[PDB]
Amino acid sequence: TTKESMGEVMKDSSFALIEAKYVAGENIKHIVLENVQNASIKVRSRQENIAGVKIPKFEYFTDGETKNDLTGLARGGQQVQQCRAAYVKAIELLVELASLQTSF
Amino acid sequence: AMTFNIHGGYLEAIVRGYRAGLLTIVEKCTLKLVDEYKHMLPLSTFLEYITYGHMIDNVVLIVTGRDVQELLEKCHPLGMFDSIMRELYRLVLVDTPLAPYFSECITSEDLDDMNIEIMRNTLYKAYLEDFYKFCQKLGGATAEIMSDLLAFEADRRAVNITINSIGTELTRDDRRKLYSLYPYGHEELAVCEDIDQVRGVMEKYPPYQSIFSKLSYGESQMLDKAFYEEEVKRLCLAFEQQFHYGVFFAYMRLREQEIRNLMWISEC
Amino acid sequence: SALIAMIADEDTVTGFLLAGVGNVDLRRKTNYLIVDSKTTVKAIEDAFKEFTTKEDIAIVLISQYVANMIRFLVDSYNKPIPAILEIPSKDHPYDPAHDSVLSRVKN
């Protein structure tokens, strides 16, 4: 079910990237990599137990704790709302994949 | 009036014809426009200022390093000319109008040009210096267009500061100290912390009134896009281009806008 | 823990990599350039050895496994937590086709 999020949020991020490119041309990239305002990526882990199996739980920046932001680009708000919004979907997909592997 | 026929008439006619003909595809169009501009080489100073316009951003990008070698890939002669890290900044301080002022204003180098926000501040300061230099060369109707562009950039920077960059030390004082009627009445935007407040500040200029409108688009973007998008929408005024006047900058702006539109087209 | 791809469509990765800090999985001492298409994912596999296998990077992503060495990367099932792969869409369609983790998921 959550696999479709990896397409929907990706399409939204692509649209935001096109809008940002139309706004400010080429992004700064390089030193700060530009393209975002949120997503100071740092991941935290937790261990849940279901039927005696230690199913891991995953949280990270823009999908939990350890998140920070500063300024951003022109469409940096739109980029965060689309490109950084896929972070929650990615974290959920990663948690689901880890749980599936452990359960298997 | 007779000076136009005395000199510059052929170049003006060639520029007018090229503009009238205008309407990796985006990269190819940009390269063709840059080649057309270069082949055209009083008006020399205007061309130098027009090139320095984008050369300020090109030099700001090259100031990195940090994957600095990638700057050669975007070496478009229109803005990324080779002639236009404090040790390298001093060397790059030559052959540019805004560089000597930025040498003192941005003497902290990367400290005052951090890639997160302070690099944008240095770019805005350089843009303000370039706009001041261009406005110094007064004598034509392009002064109004240059003032409108500088006002749009300053207002967009102020709106971005009030929206979210206020937490990034872009306070009311920084709305003009670092963020590049505006050259005399920009103080009204120092307290426009809300979209409704932005519209109220825009109400001080009846031409700027109703330009913000609902502010859902254009003003929604940070950096210099808020009031710059208003100038992009109103660029139909630049499309007039009355004859016997400096229209090289107008043609360059129209070509840049066409390139941007082609890029925004992309895969439909 | 850290999480980054660095084997991706550049701006697509940078849109969720580093804006407020952490240097996109600590680029000061880890991570790599987020732009793909310069070479095969053999260097991306080496970076996974240098980033994901370095006990720091937890989640990784390869865009649709276009050149991600699906058979080679399918071995990441062992120790799944430090090698949580992903198949992002955009500029390459996300499909249940052969990949690192989805190939096993296809079973």
Side-chain angles (χ1 to χ4, degrees), chain A residues 2 7 16 18 20 24-25 39 51-52 56 64 72 74 76-77 85-86 90 98 100, chain B residues 1 8-9 13 17 20-21 42 53 64-65 77 79 97 99-100 126 139-143 151 154 158 167 183 185 190 200 206-207 218 226 238 246 250, chain C residues 2 5 8 15 19-20 22 43 47 58 67 80 82-83 88 93 96-97 102:
Chain A
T2 197
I18 301 299
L100 191 76
Chain B
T64 63
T142 179
Chain C
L102 311 93

PDB file of all heavy atoms in Angstrom, chain A residues 39-45 58-68, chain C residues 1-4 16-17 21-26 56 58, unseen atoms left out:
ATOM      1  N   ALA A  39      14.825  18.913   6.410  1.00  0.00           N
ATOM      2  CA  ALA A  39      15.586  17.681   6.214  1.00  0.00           C
ATOM      3  C   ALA A  39      17.063  17.808   6.569  1.00  0.00           C
ATOM      4  O   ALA A  39      17.935  17.582   5.724  1.00  0.00           O
ATOM      5  CB  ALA A  39      15.443  17.185   4.771  1.00  0.00           C
ATOM      6  N   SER A  40      17.351  18.177   7.819  1.00  0.00           N
ATOM      7  CA  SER A  40      18.682  17.993   8.398  1.00  0.00           C
ATOM      8  C   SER A  40      18.768  16.543   8.861  1.00  0.00           C
ATOM      9  O   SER A  40      18.635  16.217  10.045  1.00  0.00           O
ATOM     10  CB  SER A  40      18.920  18.974   9.539  1.00  0.00           C
ATOM     11  N   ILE A  41      19.010  15.657   7.894  1.00  0.00           N
ATOM     12  CA  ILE A  41      18.766  14.224   8.037  1.00  0.00           C
ATOM     13  C   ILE A  41      19.579  13.605   9.166  1.00  0.00           C
ATOM     14  O   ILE A  41      20.812  13.559   9.114  1.00  0.00           O
ATOM     15  CB  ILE A  41      19.054  13.495   6.711  1.00  0.00           C
ATOM     16  N   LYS A  42      18.881  13.111  10.185  1.00  0.00           N
ATOM     17  CA  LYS A  42      19.476  12.333  11.266  1.00  0.00           C
ATOM     18  C   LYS A  42      18.431  11.346  11.758  1.00  0.00           C
ATOM     19  O   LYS A  42      17.299  11.740  12.053  1.00  0.00           O
ATOM     20  CB  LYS A  42      19.956  13.231  12.411  1.00  0.00           C
ATOM     21  N   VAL A  43      18.811  10.074  11.857  1.00  0.00           N
ATOM     22  CA  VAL A  43      17.870   8.976  12.051  1.00  0.00           C
ATOM     23  C   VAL A  43      18.010   8.432  13.465  1.00  0.00           C
ATOM     24  O   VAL A  43      19.128   8.260  13.966  1.00  0.00           O
ATOM     25  CB  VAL A  43      18.089   7.860  11.014  1.00  0.00           C
ATOM     26  N   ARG A  44      16.874   8.163  14.106  1.00  0.00           N
ATOM     27  CA  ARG A  44      16.820   7.508  15.402  1.00  0.00           C
ATOM     28  C   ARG A  44      16.050   6.199  15.272  1.00  0.00           C
ATOM     29  O   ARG A  44      15.133   6.080  14.455  1.00  0.00           O
ATOM     30  CB  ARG A  44      16.159   8.404  16.458  1.00  0.00           C
ATOM     31  N   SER A  45      16.425   5.215  16.085  1.00  0.00           N
ATOM     32  CA  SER A  45      15.868   3.874  15.977  1.00  0.00           C
ATOM     33  C   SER A  45      15.223   3.455  17.290  1.00  0.00           C
ATOM     34  O   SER A  45      15.667   3.845  18.375  1.00  0.00           O
ATOM     35  CB  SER A  45      16.943   2.853  15.579  1.00  0.00           C
ATOM     36  N   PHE A  58      11.603   3.202  13.233  1.00  0.00           N
ATOM     37  CA  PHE A  58      12.515   4.183  12.662  1.00  0.00           C
ATOM     38  C   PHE A  58      11.897   5.573  12.702  1.00  0.00           C
ATOM     39  O   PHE A  58      10.737   5.755  12.313  1.00  0.00           O
ATOM     40  CB  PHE A  58      12.880   3.812  11.222  1.00  0.00           C
ATOM     41  N   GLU A  59      12.675   6.545  13.174  1.00  0.00           N
ATOM     42  CA  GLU A  59      12.316   7.954  13.122  1.00  0.00           C
ATOM     43  C   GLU A  59      13.541   8.753  12.701  1.00  0.00           C
ATOM     44  O   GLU A  59      14.678   8.368  12.986  1.00  0.00           O
ATOM     45  CB  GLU A  59      11.794   8.459  14.475  1.00  0.00           C
ATOM     46  N   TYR A  60      13.306   9.872  12.022  1.00  0.00           N
ATOM     47  CA  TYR A  60      14.405  10.666  11.485  1.00  0.00           C
ATOM     48  C   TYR A  60      13.933  12.101  11.293  1.00  0.00           C
ATOM     49  O   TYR A  60      12.806  12.460  11.645  1.00  0.00           O
ATOM     50  CB  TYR A  60      14.925  10.070  10.174  1.00  0.00           C
ATOM     51  N   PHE A  61      14.821  12.925  10.736  1.00  0.00           N
ATOM     52  CA  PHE A  61      14.478  14.309  10.446  1.00  0.00           C
ATOM     53  C   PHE A  61      13.351  14.377   9.423  1.00  0.00           C
ATOM     54  O   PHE A  61      13.291  13.575   8.488  1.00  0.00           O
ATOM     55  CB  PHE A  61      15.703  15.062   9.928  1.00  0.00           C
ATOM     56  N   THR A  62      12.439  15.333   9.631  1.00  0.00           N
ATOM     57  CA  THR A  62      11.260  15.544   8.793  1.00  0.00           C
ATOM     58  C   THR A  62      10.308  14.354   8.858  1.00  0.00           C
ATOM     59  O   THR A  62       9.268  14.344   8.194  1.00  0.00           O
ATOM     60  CB  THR A  62      11.659  15.827   7.339  1.00  0.00           C
ATOM     61  N   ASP A  63      10.662  13.343   9.658  1.00  0.00           N
ATOM     62  CA  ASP A  63       9.802  12.196   9.911  1.00  0.00           C
ATOM     63  C   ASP A  63       9.890  11.769  11.370  1.00  0.00           C
ATOM     64  O   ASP A  63       9.700  10.591  11.689  1.00  0.00           O
ATOM     65  CB  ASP A  63      10.163  11.023   8.995  1.00  0.00           C
ATOM     66  N   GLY A  64      10.181  12.703  12.254  1.00  0.00           N
ATOM     67  CA  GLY A  64      10.368  12.415  13.656  1.00  0.00           C
ATOM     68  C   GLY A  64      11.280  13.462  14.285  1.00  0.00           C
ATOM     69  O   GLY A  64      11.181  14.649  13.969  1.00  0.00           O
ATOM     70  N   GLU A  65      12.161  12.997  15.165  1.00  0.00           N
ATOM     71  CA  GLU A  65      13.062  13.883  15.884  1.00  0.00           C
ATOM     72  C   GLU A  65      14.304  14.187  15.045  1.00  0.00           C
ATOM     73  O   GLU A  65      14.426  13.775  13.888  1.00  0.00           O
ATOM     74  CB  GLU A  65      13.447  13.267  17.228  1.00  0.00           C
ATOM     75  N   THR A  66      15.235  14.932  15.648  1.00  0.00           N
ATOM     76  CA  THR A  66      16.522  15.274  15.037  1.00  0.00           C
ATOM     77  C   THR A  66      16.354  16.042  13.730  1.00  0.00           C
ATOM     78  O   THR A  66      17.102  15.828  12.773  1.00  0.00           O
ATOM     79  CB  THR A  66      17.382  14.025  14.816  1.00  0.00           C
ATOM     80  N   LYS A  67      15.382  16.947  13.678  1.00  0.00           N
ATOM     81  CA  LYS A  67      15.121  17.748  12.494  1.00  0.00           C
ATOM     82  C   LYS A  67      15.447  19.215  12.755  1.00  0.00           C
ATOM     83  O   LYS A  67      15.248  19.729  13.858  1.00  0.00           O
ATOM     84  CB  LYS A  67      13.662  17.612  12.051  1.00  0.00           C
ATOM     85  N   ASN A  68      15.958  19.883  11.723  1.00  0.00           N
ATOM     86  CA  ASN A  68      16.291  21.297  11.812  1.00  0.00           C
ATOM     87  C   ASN A  68      16.170  21.915  10.427  1.00  0.00           C
ATOM     88  O   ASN A  68      16.215  21.218   9.411  1.00  0.00           O
ATOM     89  CB  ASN A  68      17.700  21.511  12.380  1.00  0.00           C
TER      90      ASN A  68
ATOM     91  N   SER C   1      21.616   7.864  13.987  1.00  0.00           N
ATOM     92  CA  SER C   1      21.951   7.204  12.732  1.00  0.00           C
ATOM     93  C   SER C   1      21.814   8.162  11.555  1.00  0.00           C
ATOM     94  O   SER C   1      21.209   9.228  11.677  1.00  0.00           O
ATOM     95  CB  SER C   1      21.064   5.976  12.516  1.00  0.00           C
ATOM     96  N   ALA C   2      22.380   7.777  10.415  1.00  0.00           N
ATOM     97  CA  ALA C   2      22.338   8.575   9.200  1.00  0.00           C
ATOM     98  C   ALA C   2      21.507   7.862   8.141  1.00  0.00           C
ATOM     99  O   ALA C   2      21.183   6.679   8.261  1.00  0.00           O
ATOM    100  CB  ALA C   2      23.751   8.854   8.674  1.00  0.00           C
ATOM    101  N   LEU C   3      21.162   8.605   7.091  1.00  0.00           N
ATOM    102  CA  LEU C   3      20.381   8.056   5.986  1.00  0.00           C
ATOM    103  C   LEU C   3      20.550   8.964   4.782  1.00  0.00           C
ATOM    104  O   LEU C   3      20.231  10.155   4.857  1.00  0.00           O
ATOM    105  CB  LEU C   3      18.905   7.928   6.364  1.00  0.00           C
ATOM    106  N   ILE C   4      21.049   8.408   3.677  1.00  0.00           N
ATOM    107  CA  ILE C   4      21.269   9.173   2.455  1.00  0.00           C
ATOM    108  C   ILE C   4      21.404   8.194   1.303  1.00  0.00           C
ATOM    109  O   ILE C   4      21.680   7.010   1.503  1.00  0.00           O
ATOM    110  CB  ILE C   4      22.519  10.083   2.569  1.00  0.00           C
ATOM    111  N   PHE C  16      15.873  16.424   0.035  1.00  0.00           N
ATOM    112  CA  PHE C  16      15.621  15.843   1.347  1.00  0.00           C
ATOM    113  C   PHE C  16      16.911  15.383   2.015  1.00  0.00           C
ATOM    114  O   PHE C  16      16.893  14.453   2.829  1.00  0.00           O
ATOM    115  CB  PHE C  16      14.639  14.671   1.250  1.00  0.00           C
ATOM    116  N   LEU C  17      18.038  16.019   1.692  1.00  0.00           N
ATOM    117  CA  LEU C  17      19.340  15.550   2.148  1.00  0.00           C
ATOM    118  C   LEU C  17      19.969  16.466   3.189  1.00  0.00           C
ATOM    119  O   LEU C  17      20.277  16.019   4.298  1.00  0.00           O
ATOM    120  CB  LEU C  17      20.285  15.388   0.949  1.00  0.00           C
ATOM    121  N   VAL C  21      21.294  21.037   8.406  1.00  0.00           N
ATOM    122  CA  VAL C  21      22.463  20.485   9.057  1.00  0.00           C
ATOM    123  C   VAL C  21      22.672  19.034   8.668  1.00  0.00           C
ATOM    124  O   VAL C  21      22.055  18.524   7.732  1.00  0.00           O
ATOM    125  N   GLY C  22      23.589  18.397   9.402  1.00  0.00           N
ATOM    126  CA  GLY C  22      23.951  16.989   9.253  1.00  0.00           C
ATOM    127  C   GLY C  22      24.690  16.721   7.945  1.00  0.00           C
ATOM    128  O   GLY C  22      25.155  15.601   7.714  1.00  0.00           O
ATOM    129  N   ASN C  23      24.805  17.745   7.095  1.00  0.00           N
ATOM    130  CA  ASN C  23      25.624  17.694   5.879  1.00  0.00           C
ATOM    131  C   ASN C  23      25.286  16.490   5.001  1.00  0.00           C
ATOM    132  O   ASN C  23      26.160  15.940   4.329  1.00  0.00           O
ATOM    133  CB  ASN C  23      27.115  17.699   6.225  1.00  0.00           C
ATOM    134  N   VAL C  24      24.016  16.080   4.997  1.00  0.00           N
ATOM    135  CA  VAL C  24      23.551  14.941   4.208  1.00  0.00           C
ATOM    136  C   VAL C  24      24.384  13.714   4.549  1.00  0.00           C
ATOM    137  O   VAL C  24      25.245  13.301   3.762  1.00  0.00           O
ATOM    138  CB  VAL C  24      23.601  15.238   2.697  1.00  0.00           C
ATOM    139  N   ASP C  25      24.140  13.139   5.727  1.00  0.00           N
ATOM    140  CA  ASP C  25      24.901  11.993   6.230  1.00  0.00           C
ATOM    141  C   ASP C  25      26.373  12.344   6.419  1.00  0.00           C
ATOM    142  O   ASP C  25      27.265  11.561   6.085  1.00  0.00           O
ATOM    143  CB  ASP C  25      24.740  10.769   5.323  1.00  0.00           C
ATOM    144  N   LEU C  26      26.629  13.540   6.954  1.00  0.00           N
ATOM    145  CA  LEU C  26      27.965  13.978   7.361  1.00  0.00           C
ATOM    146  C   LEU C  26      28.944  13.939   6.183  1.00  0.00           C
ATOM    147  O   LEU C  26      29.904  13.167   6.152  1.00  0.00           O
ATOM    148  CB  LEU C  26      28.478  13.135   8.536  1.00  0.00           C
ATOM    149  N   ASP C  56      26.805   3.894  10.161  1.00  0.00           N
ATOM    150  CA  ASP C  56      26.226   5.226  10.320  1.00  0.00           C
ATOM    151  C   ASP C  56      24.961   5.397   9.489  1.00  0.00           C
ATOM    152  O   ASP C  56      23.917   5.797  10.013  1.00  0.00           O
ATOM    153  CB  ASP C  56      27.263   6.294   9.948  1.00  0.00           C
ATOM    154  N   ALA C  58      21.673   4.368   7.760  1.00  0.00           N
ATOM    155  CA  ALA C  58      20.671   3.332   7.983  1.00  0.00           C
ATOM    156  C   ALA C  58      19.858   3.057   6.720  1.00  0.00           C
ATOM    157  O   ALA C  58      19.724   1.904   6.300  1.00  0.00           O
ATOM    158  CB  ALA C  58      19.751   3.734   9.141  1.00  0.00           C
TER     159      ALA C  58
END
